Amino acid sequence: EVQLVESGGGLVQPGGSLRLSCAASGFNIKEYYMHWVRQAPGKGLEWVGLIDPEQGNTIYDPKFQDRATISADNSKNTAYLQMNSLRAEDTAVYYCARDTAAYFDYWGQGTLVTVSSASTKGPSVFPLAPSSGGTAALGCLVKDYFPEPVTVSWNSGALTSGVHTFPAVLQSSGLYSLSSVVTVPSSSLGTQTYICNVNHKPSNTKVDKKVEP
Amino acid sequence: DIQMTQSPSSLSASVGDRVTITCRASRDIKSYLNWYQQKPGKAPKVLIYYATSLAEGVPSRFSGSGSGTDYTLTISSLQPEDFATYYCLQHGESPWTFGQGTKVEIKRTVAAPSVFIFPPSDEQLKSGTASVVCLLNNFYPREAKVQWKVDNALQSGNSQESVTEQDSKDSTYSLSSTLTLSKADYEKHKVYACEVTHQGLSSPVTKSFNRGE
Amino acid sequence: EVQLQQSGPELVKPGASVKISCKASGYSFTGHLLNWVKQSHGKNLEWIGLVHPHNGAITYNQKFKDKATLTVDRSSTTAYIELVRLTSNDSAVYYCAREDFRYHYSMDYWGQGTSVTVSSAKTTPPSVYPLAPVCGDTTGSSVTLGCLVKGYFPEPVTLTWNSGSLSSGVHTFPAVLQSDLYTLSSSVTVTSSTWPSQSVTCNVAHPASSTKVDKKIVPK
Amino acid sequence: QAVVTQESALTSSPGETVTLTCRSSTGAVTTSNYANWVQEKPDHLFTGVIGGTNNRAPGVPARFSGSLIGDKAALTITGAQTEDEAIYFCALWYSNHWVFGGGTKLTVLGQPKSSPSVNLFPPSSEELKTKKATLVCTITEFYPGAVRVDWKADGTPVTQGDETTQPSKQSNNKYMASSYLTLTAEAWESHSSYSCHVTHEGQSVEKSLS
């Protein structure tokens, strides 16, 4: 059973370097073409490069202009990807892939590399109060946090229907912002209590904001 | 580099349909073309290699055709598990490059968005910033134009949007547009509005509120 | 290192069929294309078709769509080309050639090739004719004599001079195909004081027909 | 069906920078043609040189490089070595098949030029008894290995009945070749002068007989 496990992902300062590893099992990397592929948040796939088993050649996308170095240690049955002078556009999920006939037959789970000079910060949670049809919408603005992720629940979890927790967006400040809304009947405004439970583990932030008109 | 253009960027289909996705290389790639499937948060999966070969273990409803610069991926009987994103990979020249992708999503009847606007909360204004949130709830198709209007003035560069993935129950979409301003700038105008244009509505729907009052 | 060992020479009549093999070793078999090339006369190359060893997908040159049949066998990492309905037009050397499709799209490693000879000719010994000069007198202290080994089949024929005594100044040329049979020539250059005072004799042998001929070269 | 043409032969010296070209009859050679260059050394030994227009095959010396110059593909040898003497074939891809060029024999001068020693032989009386006649023209000791042979009968060119061997190298590295003029015993009796013309480096060497 072929398996590829990558590690080395994590937070890196712009200008810094990343060292990812890909532990193989169920085959010997020594006898296969190994590649590195990546995917930035919400974007398409990109080829980084490969390492040829026949003579040790390493070929990369010129785009990377000598910043990428792919290597391998047969004694550890591990392949490596090193990249220097990291920039924001290098923020991505990096995959390690095995090649058979130039198509990728096996992939690792993927390691996320985040390139940013931002500091850990818990979010501010602001209410999106009802306007005051038989349906009203209300919610929470989970603003200015870093890094991802942040979890949102309503009424400790006893409210799931009609809830939309939107994908986070990266603001020009390097911090994230996100909104969670829910549609409820207009009549319940007052009778029923709506609380959004926000949690951001990296900053130990736990906020419970009651939302009302 | 060789430019791979996939068409269309997204396609609406129903279970049972015959679906076709094309990839066009800028120059002849000698059939050195692979096709991949990718689902949210997961690594890609090979479907077709060498332009026309069905990879091992891949459902036979997937087939590749073409040569030269024109290639097509055909899914003969669209299954629920087939809704995902598809990419072509070109290896006729180093560096290998992927198409932009084609997301195959579920077709359903036209559903007009229920629109809601939220003013900045008093607690946020106190911190010096102002976020105005416009919500487009449960709509179909995806295409929606959300324009911000401050005292009849069209906004640009100060808003960000986020869309959910198709709902598992009703197959609709939800979107949020956040207009972000400093308290200073926010206080320079009174009327705040978001105008939504979508196929499901006769003419543009406009939601607004007079600042403060 | 990578190697592509092809099977040995072939000699058959028109209408027959032949299946050449190419044993590819020293690398991953399913990761490079294998092409088949035809070399006519010793120069001029022609591409027959390609095969992707991972699943036997093929692309044939339309000029050979009905003559060649490309095939591969993964358990022994060998490629094959079967030529059918052979005519004399199919006599040529066939090569198997590896082609990368990852970054240097080169036809890098080639097999040593397989010679195919298609003829309706029967084993026939050569007629040996003397090549003696008569432009006049001695225009130099050297004189060149030879022997025309004409109309034999199949190749080859050997040739010596004075049973091997004259080894220096000997040239044995390549064979040409004259109406289904082969012809070749050999020459020897000796001092003018040596001939015809001293005898010069060409020893031709045609192993296929177990024939030997000695031709004494005398003045015209 | 498309024709790919290469220079017949080219001669250079060690240290020189030489350029072999490859032309397509359909139009300009393009990257879609995947220009490929193959080296054929003596004893029928083929080795890839360039693939994909300008990619040096792994193992190949940095002095070899390929490209597109004008509307033709090209192989440049920067500092031609003696080891580089060989026949270079070009191949272009036209969507679904390859077409080879006629090849270019490249000579890397390792010795002084040498004119061909020509010897023309009349038909033997033995062969005339078969009512056939063969004139044998031996051509040896020529360098570089490229010549053109022509025959004449009583002052006029012969256009049929001739056959010449492709040059092969002798032990001293120069070249040898042979040509045949096939006549019936009748034609041999009706004419009186026969000439074997061998042209090397533009100069014609001739042998005649009666």
Short mmCIF file of N, CA and C in Angstrom, two decimals, chain B residues 60 65 95 106 116 136 158 162 185:
data_model
loop_
_atom_site.label_atom_id
_atom_site.label_comp_id
_atom_site.label_asym_id
_atom_site.label_seq_id
_atom_site.Cartn_x
_atom_site.Cartn_y
_atom_site.Cartn_z
N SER B 60 -15.63 3.94 -15.81
CA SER B 60 -15.63 4.00 -17.26
C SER B 60 -16.46 5.13 -17.88
N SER B 65 -10.58 12.37 -25.11
CA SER B 65 -10.39 12.36 -26.55
C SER B 65 -9.62 13.61 -26.99
N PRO B 95 7.98 23.90 -18.12
CA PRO B 95 7.19 23.35 -17.01
C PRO B 95 5.80 22.85 -17.37
N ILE B 106 -24.37 21.59 -9.45
CA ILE B 106 -25.74 21.15 -9.65
C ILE B 106 -26.73 22.16 -10.20
N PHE B 116 -30.58 41.48 2.41
CA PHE B 116 -30.60 42.13 3.72
C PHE B 116 -29.37 43.03 3.90
N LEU B 136 -26.90 38.26 0.54
CA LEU B 136 -27.73 37.68 -0.53
C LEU B 136 -27.96 36.24 -0.06
N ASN B 158 -13.33 49.15 -1.98
CA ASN B 158 -13.47 49.09 -0.53
C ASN B 158 -14.46 48.03 -0.02
N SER B 162 -17.80 37.08 -0.26
CA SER B 162 -17.54 35.70 0.10
C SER B 162 -18.80 34.91 -0.24
N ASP B 185 -14.63 58.38 7.50
CA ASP B 185 -15.24 58.30 6.16
C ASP B 185 -16.71 57.91 6.22
#
